[PDB]
Amino acid sequence: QVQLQQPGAELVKPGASVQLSCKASGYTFTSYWMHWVKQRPGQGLEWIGMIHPTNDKTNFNEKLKSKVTLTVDKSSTTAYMQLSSLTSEDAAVYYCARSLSAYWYFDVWGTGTTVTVSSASTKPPSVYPLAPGSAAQTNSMVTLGCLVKGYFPEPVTVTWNSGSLSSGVHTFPAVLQSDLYTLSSSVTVPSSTWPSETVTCNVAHPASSTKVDKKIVP
Amino acid sequence: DILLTQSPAILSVSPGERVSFSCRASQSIGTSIHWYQQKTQGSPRLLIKYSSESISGIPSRFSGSGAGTDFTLSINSVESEDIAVFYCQQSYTWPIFTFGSGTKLEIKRADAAPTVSIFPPSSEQLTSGGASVVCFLNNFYPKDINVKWKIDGSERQNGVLNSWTDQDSKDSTYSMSSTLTLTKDEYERHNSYTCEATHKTSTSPIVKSFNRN
Amino acid sequence: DLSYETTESGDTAVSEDSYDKYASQNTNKEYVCDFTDQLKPTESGPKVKKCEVKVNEPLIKVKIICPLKGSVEKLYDNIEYVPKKSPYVVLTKEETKLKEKLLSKLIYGLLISPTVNEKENNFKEGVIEFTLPPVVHKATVFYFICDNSKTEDDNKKGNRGIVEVYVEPY
Numbered sequence: 001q002v003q004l005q006q007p008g009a010e011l012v013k014p015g016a017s018v019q020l021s022c023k024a025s026g027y028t029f030t031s032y033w034m035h036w037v038k039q040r041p042g043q044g045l046e047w048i049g050m051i052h053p054t055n056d057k058t059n060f061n062e063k064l065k066s067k068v069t070l071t072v073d074k075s076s077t078t079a080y081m082q083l084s085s086l087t088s089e090d091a092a093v094y095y096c097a098r099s100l101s102a103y104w105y106f107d108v109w110g111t112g113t114t115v116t117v118s119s120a121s122t123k124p125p126s127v128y129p130l131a132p133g134s135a136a137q138t139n140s141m142v143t144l145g146c147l148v149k150g151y152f153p154e155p156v157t158v159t160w161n162s163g164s165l166s167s168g169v170h171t172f173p174a175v176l177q178s179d180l181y182t183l184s185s186s187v188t189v190p191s192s193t194w195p196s197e198t199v200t201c202n203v204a205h206p207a208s209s210t211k212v213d214k215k216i217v218p
Numbered sequence: 219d220i221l222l223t224q225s226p227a228i229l230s231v232s233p234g235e236r237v238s239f240s241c242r243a244s245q246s247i248g249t250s251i252h253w254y255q256q257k258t259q260g261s262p263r264l265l266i267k268y269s270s271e272s273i274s275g276i277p278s279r280f281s282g283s284g285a286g287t288d289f290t291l292s293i294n295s296v297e298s299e300d301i302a303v304f305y306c307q308q309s310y311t312w313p314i315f316t317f318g319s320g321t322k323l324e325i326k327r328a329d330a331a332p333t334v335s336i337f338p339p340s341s342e343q344l345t346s347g348g349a350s351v352v353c354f355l356n357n358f359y360p361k362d363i364n365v366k367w368k369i370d371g372s373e374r375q376n377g378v379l380n381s382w383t384d385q386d387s388k389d390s391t392y393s394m395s396s397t398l399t400l401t402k403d404e405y406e407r408h409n410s411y412t413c414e415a416t417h418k419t420s421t422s423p424i425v426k427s428f429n430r431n
Numbered sequence: 432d433l434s435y436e437t438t439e440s441g442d443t444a445v446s447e448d449s450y451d452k453y454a455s456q457n458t459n460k461e462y463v464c465d466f467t468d469q470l471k472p473t474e475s476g477p478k479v480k481k482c483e484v485k486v487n488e489p490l491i492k493v494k495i496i497c498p499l500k501g502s503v504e505k506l507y508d509n510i511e512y513v514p515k516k517s518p519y520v521v522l523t524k525e526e527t528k529l530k531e532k533l534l535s536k537l538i539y540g541l542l543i544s545p546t547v548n549e550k551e552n553n554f555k556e557g558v559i560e561f562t563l564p565p566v567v568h569k570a571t572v573f574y575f576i577c578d579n580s581k582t583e584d585d586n587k588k589g590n591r592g593i594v595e596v597y598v599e600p601y
Contacts, residue, residue, distance in 0.1 A: 008237040035315075037262075045254075045262065045305050045317040059313040095261060103471060104309035104505045107273070109261040115416075128342040130352060132335070135428070143335045147342075147352055147397070170356050172381035172395040173288065184395045186354045188333070245452040248469045248480055269451070271473055285480075286453030309468055310456075 001026035004096050004110035008206030011116050011153050012086045015163045022079040022096035030054050032098040034079040035106060036070065040092040051079065073204050083115075091117045116153035116207075120179055125151030127203045130184070131216055136196035144216045146201035149182040157204040158185045164188075165199060201218070220311050224304075230295050230324045233390075238292040239321045241306035245341050246286040251308035253282055253291045256303035256320075257302040258384035260329040265304075268293060298313055298325055308309065324361075325390045329418070332394075334363035334412045336426040339405075348378075348402030353413035357391040363417025364398045368427070376400060406430075434520050439513060439529045444477045444580050444591060452481040455493075462486065463498040466592045470504050470579040474587040477580035479549030481593040482505055487601055488563040495594055497577040499557045505584045512554040514577030518543050518561050521573035521596075538571055538598060563598060571598045 012018045015055055022034065038050040049060035051070040058070045067090075070194050071080035079096055094113050097106035114132040130145025145198035174181040185201055193199075200215045221244040233239045241251060242324055249269035255264040265272050266282035269289055282291045293300060306318040332355040342348045367378055377399035383392055396413065412427035441447070455462045464482035466552065475521070484493055485503040491576030500510045514520040514531055522529040535541050542562040543552065554577075573596050 044320045045256075047307075047315045047317060050313070061314060061316075088307060092235075097319075102312075102506055103267070104250075104312050104468065105264060105307070106254070107264050109263070112261060126342070126345070128350065130337045131340065133338055133428075135336075141333075143333065143354060143356070145337055145352060145354060146334075147350055149350065162398045170354070170383060170393045170395075172383055172393070175379045175381055175397075177377075177379055177399075182397065182399075183380070184354070184397055186335075186353050186356055186393070186395065188356065213222070216383045231594050245456050245458075247456070248465075248482070249451055266469075268473060271475060285451040310465070310466055401455045 002108050004108060006094075006096060006110040006113045006159075007202055008111075008155060009114045009116065009153060011118065011207055012090075012116055013119050014087060017082065017084045018086060018115060018117070019084065020081040020094055020113050024077045024079065024098070026043055027098075029074060029077040032073065034057075034070075035097045035099060036068075036081045037095045037097060038092045039095065042153055048081075053079075057091075073195055086117045088117050091115055097127065114153075114155050116180075118153065122208045123150065123152045123180065124205050124208040125149065125156060125181075125183075125203060126213070127201065127212045127214040128215050129216045131218055133218070137191050139191065141188055142194050143186060144194060144199055145187070145190045146185040146203070146214060146216070147182075148184065148203050150180045151181055151183075151205055153207050154181060155206070156181070156183055157206070158183070159202045160185075160187050161200055162202055219253060220247060220308055220316070222306055222308055222316060223224070224306060224318040224321045226321065227319070227323060228322045230326050232297055233325060233327070234295055236281075236292065236294050237296045237323060239304050239306075240426040241284075241289040241291070241318050243287050243289070243308060243310075245321050245413060247308055249285050250308050251282070251284065251289045252307045252309065254303065254305045254307065254332060255300075255302045260302070263382075266351045271346045274301035298385070298390045299390065301325060301387070324385060327359060327390055330357060330359040330389075330391050332363060332415065332417050332424070334413065334415055334424050336428050338428060339348060343402065346402070349400040349405035350397060351399065351405075351411055351413070352395060352397040354393070354395050355417065356393040357389050358417050360395070361392055361396055363415060366414040366416060367396070368412040368414055370410055374398070374400070434516065434533055435514070435531045437531055439522065439576065440527060441529070441593060442479065442591070443578070444478075444479075444582055446479050450479040450481050450593075452483060455484040460488075460490060461492045462496055463494045463496065464594045466577045467496055468497045470498060470510070470577060470590045470592050472579070472582055472584035472587045472589040477588045479593060480590055480592040481595060484594060484596040486563050486596065486598045487565075489563070489601060492560060493563065493596060494560045494566045495557065496558050497554050497592070498579070502557070505582075506589070507579060507582060508584070509581030509583070510577070510579045510589070512578070513548060513574065515554070517554045517559045517575060518552045523573055524573065532573070534561065534573065537573060538564060538567060540566075567598050567601055570600055572596065
């Protein structure tokens with residue numbers, strides 16, 4: 001029941017500030033340090049700092065302290081990281097994580113906020129079905145798709161049948177074209193399932209707080 | 219300054235062998251090392267605390283060891299569900315903490331052929347733009363294929379936007395989605411687009427095509 | 432005269448070859464054993480952390496940091512050290528036992544500063560220090576103990592820390 005909840009995304013304009021939130025639940029808030037960890041797209045983890053809720057004691061890696069401020073609201077068991085004067089170098093995923101007392105390991109990690117620094121506007125995606133159309137199979141398997149194109153910024157969440165289709169799924173990493181993101185997801189079922197059983201991709205774009213379903217039809 | 223070094227960047231085993239990741243500190247730090255596992259698009263998961271202490275819900279095949287400078291996270295009988303990046307973390311310099319650069323664990327099986335599929339556009343046509351020809355080439359070995367596109371006697375290397383992929387718990391078979399996109403008035407021009415390939419090492423590729431209607 | 436008379440071993444718990452043995456952290460002429468992150472209570476009972484100091488050069492400052500009882504809540508509840516007069520009194524191997532001995536009589540020319548750095552050179556202040564002489568003729572080994580194995584926090588137990596100072600002939 002231990003939980004560290006983080007918003008999916010924050011789109012920040014260059015030079016603006018951003019407030020990141022980390023809602024804790026299911027444990028004693030005042031007994032844990034709350035750390036902040038930065039991970040740039042395809043790279044490693046980078047520790048930023050930590051804060052203790054009781055005394056507001058903060059410790060930073062002095063390389064990034066100039067831009068970071070850590071904050072806690074004990075009333076709502078929420079940890080905040082303020083970031084100022086953002087640049088493209090500041091775009092990354094920012095996890096919060098907890099550590100008990102002086103045991104300096106991170107047992108419970110948050111979901112992570114994907115932070116994007118750009119002047120481009122938020123754009124919800126267009127979800128287009130991908131059906132075989134004619135090309136089937138006598139006793140083979142049918143592969144169905146879901147094209148999620150033209151959105152900004154990352155991330156996008158794609159499930160099939162609200163999550164009931166876990167296997168045979170291949171969600172491919174988004175590609176940046178013309179400052180817009182395009183993503184495709186693939187599912188695979190035997191021919192006796194589709195079109196007989198209705199499969200639907202659920203696309204959630206947290207940056208725009210937009211959700212769309214798209215049934216795959218012949 | 220205490221510096222951590224993880225070598226190598228990529229480690230490859232076989233489903234059932236013994237894997238071991240190295241974390242070296244630039245100075246002796248006792249047993250102040252902690253290990254984590256981060257799967258694709260996932261949050262890091264604590265595997266081992268203080269060099270060799272097991273965590274509450276971690277499988278017993280995860281073991282760490284070491285004191286001073288050289289630390290090793292080992293996996294006896296490795297499954298494919300263990301595919302992820304492994305970071306070490308030092309706490310000797312508390313209240314300042316740092317992570318190693320991470321070591322990626324991949325698995326290589328025997329072989330595998332990609333299940334290729336070509337696709338037309340759907341309600342994107344009614345919108346106005348269009349011209350999205352996505353081609354899935356799912357489940358294959360080794361790590362890289364070589365998809366290609368055709369026209370009416372030649373090739374268009376224009377809006378081919380490819381996307382590779384990580385591993386899988388059951389397949390360990392990579393995947394790729396080449397989505398060659400053009401304009402919705404030019405897609406109504408050639409009308410015989412083929413999605414060629416070239417994955418695997420055998421001669422003669424795998425071709426998937428379609429026609430306007 | 433007299434300066435105490437006790438008798439310990441490397442343990443007083445369990446384990447003898449499962450000891451986590453590591454070298455001190457040497458920065459220039461400062462050789463440091465820091466136990467502030469090695470002795471916290473842990474599930475696998477009482478571990479033994481043995482920090483080995485190897486002195487092969489003149490005028491090396493050996494510094495030893497022991498986490499103070501109550502410095503953090505709970506984790507060091509029953510922490511005690513080996514020689515109470517740790518800078519001036521050390522432990523020496525006598526077959527299988529460790530007994531107390533004056534350090535100045537063990538190594539001639541030991542420069543024990545009474546003020547470590549604005550504090551009393553004693554494990555009561557968390558840190559002890561001593562500088563080795565410019566010349567040592569015979570290899571000399573003495574020991575220190577920072578024992579947190581009595582501290583119980585949760586379902587795990589603290590660790591026993593050992594410093595082995597091996598002064599080589601230089």
